[PDB]
Design brief:
- Four copies of one chain form a homotetramer.
- Chain A is mainly β and 223 residues long.
- Chain A has a single domain, classed as Green Fluorescent Protein (Beta Barrel).
- Helices cover 2% and strands 55% of the residues of chain A.
- In chain A, strands 1-2-3-12-11-8-9-10-4-5-6 form an eleven-stranded mixed barrel.
- Chain A starts with 6 loop residues before the first strand and ends in a 5-residue tail after the last strand.
- Chains in contact: A-B, A-C, A-D, B-C, B-D, C-D.
- The PDB classes it as fluorescent protein.
């Protein structure tokens, strides 16, 4: 579908969180069929961010999911034209974010482009996000489900951002995934398990960090 | 504060709802001290809109609130520099929107400028917003609360959008209002009642409409 | 309708909060047409309660609401047979309660009886409820709406429990009110403003407290 | 822990849903180490129920979960004294239920006893629960999390009840699990996948049905 075992990618995110504007760019290398990716981000406007970077992590691609042969891979089937997705983030302390992403494969470059718009508000000044008290998202299991009359998928995952003191901070992710062309095949409902990690790489020059994700699709374990 | 009994205003909104991009411009006339306004909107890009216009109505100014003398008017006080606000809209069927607005008074024009960004997603294709089945918002009572030590306000109002068949469709609004300069005076908590009405004005050529709002601040009725 | 200007009432509540069982009895005197009541509660089983007594307050009667003559008084019209109500309490930190109440007028004794079942859970051990850090609910405005063709009302109020440190703790109330017998008349939607106050009266032998409420119904102030 | 390869169980549930009171009794057989159970329910008061029986299904035991040897089994370690649990059910259309269950093993009888109290409200008259339009819960993945320093667990699962017309009706479950004796060992966080199936067995004398469940615990799939 215009894809190879190893690919590069590019990222552009513009956002506003609690009224703070920012632009982030980045690049990475991934293995679409192994569901693995490693990416490096740099805050080119609005740095240093007054809020935890961890809230942005999921806003930077389900092409990078190891799918078994007997589950339709809606995301690779959408390539190379690609797909768009929209996601709401509902945090336990009343904060709300929305992210929209447009994904396109460049077959000429073997490179997957990502353009994001990220908007969020109502993070309490004294909460773990504005106080930068977060460390990493916990590993998760997302439910993926088809909307057959519409040729789109929905995702549903209850997420936990782990805190410096050892506590957890919950966020409900609800996602709509939409191929750019009408799919011939639709998957049945299944799960995707994720593990996403951040490592800071900031220095005198820029705020920057590395994200790594490993994702695998699974059917229900029950016969 | 650079305000007069009668003023004009200008509106620019850019947004995206369920992946549909659009731009809307507008102008009107209002009476700040009476808490009354009438505005006319024009869809300039992305029309006709594939969703109900009603979801957008509150995204286009608490300066137009009648305040009694013994309640601090945070919004008028913030003039002529103005203020900003951010709102989440949580609909009963899972849809989520976020709107950010920047408001500033041109004393030389006697005009209030409003620039807004509206994003929304997860409106069901068969729901009243996508099927354009709504008529008007019901009149409402918003609670306004000061945030101690941050010089900002929060707003909380449970809204109902009335449907062509006599139903109601609920949306929870949560707002943060922030003056561009530190306030010297902060209000105690109070209510604001609103009545917001839409009248279509669409050609065979163009999508356009008028909005009127009347808003009044009140303390608790129980003494 | 079996009602007088001054009446007595009786209360029996059984409940479980965070797995703690309790039984509470009470009595009071009220003024139905003036919207005022004072009641006295005594924990006869499960005392002293390991949670804030304030969560229980709204679980012990809209008969005690001053209605203007131009709004239908559904609650008084249901008497003397009475009415039942069911309410969910959704707290900002994830705690959830439900309460069900059965209300009947005894004309022989000029006394309104209240039988309630209160269930709640997921109050965090470190939170204001389990640490008894609450003082009183802030005054409120509830929206009351008729349900076309079911002979019932729905109430919607966003409540705030004031904290010892001066903070607020939010809870969303959603109520279903159901006259025992079919009403001849239904109200249009309106507001009810409430003010509810608690005074501790515990002694050497029982946990005890007094509650007072004043409630008045109003149309929209904008017509 | 007083457990055997094959065991029997007894149930008693008392409840009220939208004001309708009921009593259910039941009996089953199960295989704790294989995570399988089959139970038969009989409505002994308040039959036939005016709501879908499917909302009750999860209210009738995590002892019945196939556990990896390398994950601490909180539930079997609590036996034979047993454990209790509380759960909130937040449906997408605003209905709310709470269930509390007390579980205990009779070693003499090789029998697991369950006593439940189920209360729910705000199911819309025209919704799939009151219109009995549901067929079965879809198979799920619950996240199970230890609570540091309290010796309890929390469960979080986003559940979907399948409808006759092929649609889905969403419910968020949040559970608190509490061993009767303070545990010496706590598990790390993990998943439990479930599949729960209902078959109606109603005759002219009683409303009756069968439930089967298969549940397996898993760690995160990712390294």
């Amino acid at each position: 579908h215009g894809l190879k075992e190893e690919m590069t990618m590019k990222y552009h995110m513009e956002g506003c969180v609690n009224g703070h504007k920012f632009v982030i760019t980045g690049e990475g290398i991934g293995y679409p069929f192994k569901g693995k990716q490693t990416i490096n981000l740099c805050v080119i406007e609005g740095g240093p961010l007054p809020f935890s970077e961890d809230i942005l992590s999921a806003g930077f691609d389900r092409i990078f999911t190891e799918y078994p042969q007997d589950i339709v891979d809606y995301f690779k089937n959408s390539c190379p034209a690609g797909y768009t997705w929209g996601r709401s983030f509902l945090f336990e302390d009343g904060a709300v974010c929305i992210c929209n992403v447009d994904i396109t494969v460049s077959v000429k470059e073997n490179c997957i482009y990502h353009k994001s718009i990220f908007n969020g508000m109502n993070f309490p000044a004294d909460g773990p996000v504005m106080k930068k008290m977060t460390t990493n998202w916990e590993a998760s299991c997302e439910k993926i489900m088809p909307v057959p009359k519409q040729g789109i998928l929905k995702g549903d995952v209850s997420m936990y951002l782990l805190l410096k003191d050892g506590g957890r901070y919950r966020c409900q992710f609800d996602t709509v995934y939409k191929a750019k062309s009408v799919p011939s095949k639709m998957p049945e409902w299944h799960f995707i398990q994720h593990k996403l990690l951040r490592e800071d790489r900031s220095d005198a020059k820029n705020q920057k960090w590395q994200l790594t994700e490993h994702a695998i699709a699974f059917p229900s374990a029950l016969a």
